[PDB]
């Protein structure tokens, strides 16, 4: 199916959000749309081997981003990694969500 990272992940949250304004410090204040999607659009959670994690950025109605956060650590801890990674403007536009 096209599940958004639902079911293991919440709408954006106060810390998922806040890197929307770190690392996306124009994402975050660019799409300016008159509703809330200036931020993190939700971050789902699953292990793997270090704990995997799929942060979805949200950047507006027309603007989007995402991410995949890794706290690679498969016994071996090499340091993590990010599998996700996304800017906005129309790439990672896809409304997800129950």
């Given at each position: 199916?096209?599940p958004?990272?639902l ?16 690392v996306k410090?124009?994402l975050?204040?660019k799409?300016?749309?008159?509703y809330?999607?200036?931020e ?9 081997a270090?704990?995997?994690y ?13 991410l995949?956060?890794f ?12 599998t ?9 536009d ?5």
């Amino acid at each position: 199916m096209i599940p958004g990272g639902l079911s293991e992940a919440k709408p954006a949250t106060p810390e998922i959000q806040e890197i929307v304004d770190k690392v996306k410090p124009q994402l975050e204040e660019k799409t300016n749309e008159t509703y809330g999607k200036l931020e993190a659009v939700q971050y789902k959670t699953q292990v793997v081997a270090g704990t995997n994690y799929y942060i979805k950025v949200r950047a507006g109605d027309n603007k989007y981003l995402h991410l995949k956060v890794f706290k690679s650590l498969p016994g071996q801890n090499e340091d993590l990694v990010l599998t996700g990674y996304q800017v906005d403007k129309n790439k990672d536009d896809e409304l997800t969500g129950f």
